[PDB]
Amino acid sequence: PRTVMVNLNIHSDYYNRSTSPWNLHRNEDPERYPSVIWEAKCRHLGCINADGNVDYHMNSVPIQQEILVLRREPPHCPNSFRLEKILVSVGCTCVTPI
Amino acid sequence: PRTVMVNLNIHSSDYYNRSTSPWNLHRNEDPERYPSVIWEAKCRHLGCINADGNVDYHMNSVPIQQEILVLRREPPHCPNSFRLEKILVSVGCTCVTPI
Numbered sequence A: 001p002r003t004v005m006v007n008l009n010i011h012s013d014y015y016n017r018s019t020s021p022w023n024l025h026r027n028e029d030p031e032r033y034p035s036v037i038w039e040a041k042c043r044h045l046g047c048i049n050a051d052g053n054v055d056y057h058m059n060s061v062p063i064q065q066e067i068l069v070l071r072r073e074p075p076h077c078p079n080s081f082r083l084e085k086i087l088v089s090v091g092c093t094c095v096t097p098i
Numbered sequence B: 001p002r003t004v005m006v007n008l009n010i011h012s013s014d015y016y017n018r019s020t021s022p023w024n025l026h027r028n029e030d031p032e033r034y035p036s037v038i039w040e041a042k043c044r045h046l047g048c049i050n051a052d053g054n055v056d057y058h059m060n061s062v063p064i065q066q067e068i069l070v071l072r073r074e075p076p077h078c079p080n081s082f083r084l085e086k087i088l089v090s091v092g093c094t095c096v097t098p099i
C-alpha cells in the first residue's frame, strides 16, 4: 500500500572483444514497462584466449543485476502499475573455476 | 507527457572476485532519487588477472555499462511524486583485447 505518481517523460563492442563475449536476446511484454528487455547470453562455456581459441579451463558467466520493472495492475488499466524485481544478465565476465 | 501511478511495494555471489576483470561496488546515495542507494562496479585494475595471479596489461578490464531509469522527486522535497531519469551504470567488468 505505497502509491506514488511518475511522469514517464524521460530526463560499445565489448560484447565482441571480451574473452567472455555475448549476444543479446529480446523479451517483449506489452503489460510491462519497459516492454522490451535485452538479456546477455554468453557465447561460450569457456573464455577466448589470446590465439582466439576457447579455453574451457576458465568460465564465461553472465553478470546478473536485480532490476525493477512496472507491471500493469489491475491488468489492461493503462495508468496504474506495481513495481517488480527481476534478474537480468547485462554482460559476461571470465572466472577461474572452483 | 503521460503521468502514471506506481505501488512501490515490490513483488554466483563471488564473480566480482574470481573474474580475470575483478571489481568492487561503490555505494552512491541520493535521498531525492528512488532508488536512493545505487551500487556501481569499478574495475580493480586497468589490465586483467592472468593464470599466475598477476595483472597482464596485454588485455584491459572495462566496465559493462547499462542504461537504467531512476525516479527523481519533482517538485523537489515532495515525497510521493517523480519524473523518470536515464543514467548510465557500471554493473561489472569484462576483459577485452585492445587494438
Ligand SMILES: Cc1n[nH]c(C)c1-c1ccc(NC(=O)[C@@H](NC(=O)c2ccnn2C(C)C)C(C2CC2)C2CC2)cc1
Pocket: A033, A034, A036, A037, A038, A039, A066, A067, A068, A069, A070, A088, A090, B034, B035, B038, B066, B067, B068, B069, B070, B071
Ligand atoms: C530495456 C532493457 N534492456 N536490457 C535491460 C536490462 C533493460 C532494462 C530493464 C529494466 C529497466 N528498469 C529500470 O531502469 C528501473 N530501474 C531500476 O531498476 C534501478 C534504478 C536504479 N537502480 N536500479 C536497479 C540497480 C535496482 C526503473 C523502472 C522501470 C522504470 C526504476 C523505477 C525503478 C532498465 C533497463
